[PDB]
């Protein structure tokens, strides 16, 4: 299963020039492009090997569009400030995310396009790629403007067309990396936390993609009480890490097992102290 | 590949 996602952030800085605009693009859990309004290149830039092969027409095109994205966001900041009756003095944020999913069979699975103002939902394209979900009266004004200009249709065409088309092209051109699965390297550690209790920490390392399920069990049964799960995190080499811990009573560690599920594994793994 | 243009709010 696969996805392409673009994330766009603009942040106004009242007394200090035009908004900071940062754009990043991903294919699954792999970043492949970026743009930073403050950076020197003023170009869309590569961040994956397989995208560098793309010709200068690609780079010129993506750099024109990403810049137009930021200029449009620059307008939004002014408009939203008006919609909400806010002062010139405060820094505010707009975020746009859009992208598309394909099945394991490479056929179109779903599209999305949503928008937030100061970190909360403002407006979003519904799953039918035809209609809009608008939070408040401001977002309703936006909703009507967008319905009127058939924005959902333009977006539908992109998500079902170009989006999935270039996701596929990227997945081909970079198959050697994007389509490999790195199964998690796995182990358990043990810490005595008190006279009578120990923590068991179950580790998953250098796995890819990021999707993974670590669960604990007690006597072959799912267990949540006293379990701690951290956010899946980047190792920085393109792979991911995660751990899950339980606090058990000392001398009962044999009762517990950790189970690991991951696309790269022939089958789920079990670990015990 | 970026959408050709985005809508202002």
């Amino acid at each position, epitope marked *: 299963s696969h996805s392409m996602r673009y994330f766009f952030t603009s942040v106004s800085r009242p007394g200090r020039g035009e908004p900071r605009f940062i754009a990043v693009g991903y294919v699954d859990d792999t970043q492949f492009v970026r743009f930073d309004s403050d950076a020197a290149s003023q170009r869309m830039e590569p961040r994956a090997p397989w995208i560098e092969q793309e010709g200068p027409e690609y780079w010129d095109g993506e750099t*024109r*569009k990403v810049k*137009a994205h930021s*200029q449009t966001h620059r307008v939004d900041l002014g408009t939203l400030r008006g919609y909400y009756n806010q002062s010139e003095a405060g820094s505010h944020t707009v975020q746009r995310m859009y992208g598309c999913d394909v099945g394991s069979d490479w056929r179109f699975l779903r599209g999305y396009h949503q928008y937030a103002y100061d970190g909360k939902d403002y407006i979003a394209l519904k799953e039918d790629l035809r209609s809009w979900t608008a939070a408040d009266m401001a977002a309703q004004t936006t909703k009507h403007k*967008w319905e009127a200009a058939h*924005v959902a*249709e*333009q977006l539908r*065409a992109y998500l079902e067309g170009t989006c999935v088309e270039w996701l596929r092209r990227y997945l081909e051109n970079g198959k050697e990396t994007l389509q490999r699965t790195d199964a998690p390297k796995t182990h358990m550690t043990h810490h005595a936390v008190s006279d009578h209790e120990a923590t068991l920490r179950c580790w998953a390392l250098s796995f890819y993609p990021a999707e993974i399920t670590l669960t604990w069990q007690r006597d072959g049964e799912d267990q949540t009480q006293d379990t701690e799960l951290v956010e899946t995190r980047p190792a920085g080499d393109g792979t991911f890490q995660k751990w899950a811990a339980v606090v058990v009573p000392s001398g009962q560690e044999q009762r517990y097992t950790c189970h690991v599920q991951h696309e790269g594994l022939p089958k789920p793994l079990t670990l015990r102290w | 590949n970026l959408v050709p*243009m985005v809508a202002t709010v």
Partner: T-cell receptor, first 117, second 108 residues
Framework: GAGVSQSPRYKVTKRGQDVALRCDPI?????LYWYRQALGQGPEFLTY????????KSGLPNDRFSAERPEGSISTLTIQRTEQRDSAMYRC??????????????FGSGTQLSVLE | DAKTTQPNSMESNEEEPVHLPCNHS???????IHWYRQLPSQGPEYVIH???SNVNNRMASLAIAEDRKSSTLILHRATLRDAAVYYC?????????FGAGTRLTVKP
């Protein structure tokens, strides 16, 4: 102002000399375009701005042509070392904002530039 | 090269309908169709635009083919005042690039 304003309406410029053409867009319009138009042809795209930023200048025919919009309002198109070939109707246009909402283009009266040897 | 295609000239009688044809065979679902007109001695001005639905306003109707490969600007009752150049524009990013248009003459 309420409408797109260009000055001078007409201009005779001696070939080899520079000329500056002014566009005042509709107040608050983020986008500004420059076109030029020859007899029996449609407008030829020259350059386009969003605020102060020149987002596309692929249409500028050569290094003698340059445009600026220093404060995101007034734009000046300067042609250095004019050639007869530069003679044309120079047309400014503005629209409220860039993007999929397709804010319509508003066109000005234009500047008839005639470069004479 | 050019993205729309139009007859260079055309003529019709006053107080009768005008169908102004445009071709844009190589078009995407993200390409909008715009029509602008240019009256004598004036600059271009917006007439109508749309995506896939037919459009109607006070000045005209926009008829878009099912396959979106051609379109028609309809002047329901052209007056002499409607003689002008009509431009058919294909656009997906606000480039707003103009072709040579169709020059309409309205016979009295």
């Amino acid at each position: 102002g309420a409408g797109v304003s260009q000055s001078p309406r007409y201009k005779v410029t001696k070939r080899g000399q520079d000329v500056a053409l002014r566009c005042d867009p509709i107040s608050g319009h983020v986008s500004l375009y420059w076109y030029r138009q020859a007899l029996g042809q449609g407008p030829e795209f020259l350059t386009y701005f969003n605020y102060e930023a020149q987002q596309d200048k692929s249409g500028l025919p050569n290094d003698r042509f340059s445009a600026e919009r220093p404060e995101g309002s007034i734009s000046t198109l300067t042609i250095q070392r004019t050639e007869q070939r530069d003679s044309a109707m120079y047309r400014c246009a503005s629209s409220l904002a860039p993007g999929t909402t397709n804010e319509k283009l508003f066109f000005g009266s234009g500047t008839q530039l005639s470069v004479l040897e | 090269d050019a993205k729309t295609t139009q007859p260079n000239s055309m003529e019709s009688n006053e107080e009768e309908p005008v169908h102004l044809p445009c071709n844009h065979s190589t078009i995407s679902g993200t390409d909008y169709i715009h029509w602008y007109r240019q009256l004598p001695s004036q600059g271009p001005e917006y007439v109508i635009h749309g995506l896939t639905s037919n459009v109607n306003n006070r000045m005209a109707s926009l008829a878009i083919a099912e396959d979106r490969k051609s379109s028609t600007l309809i002047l329901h009752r052209a007056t002499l005042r409607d003689a002008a150049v009509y431009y058919c524009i294909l656009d997906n990013n606000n480039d707003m690039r103009f072709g040579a248009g169709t020059r309409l003459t309205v016979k009295p």
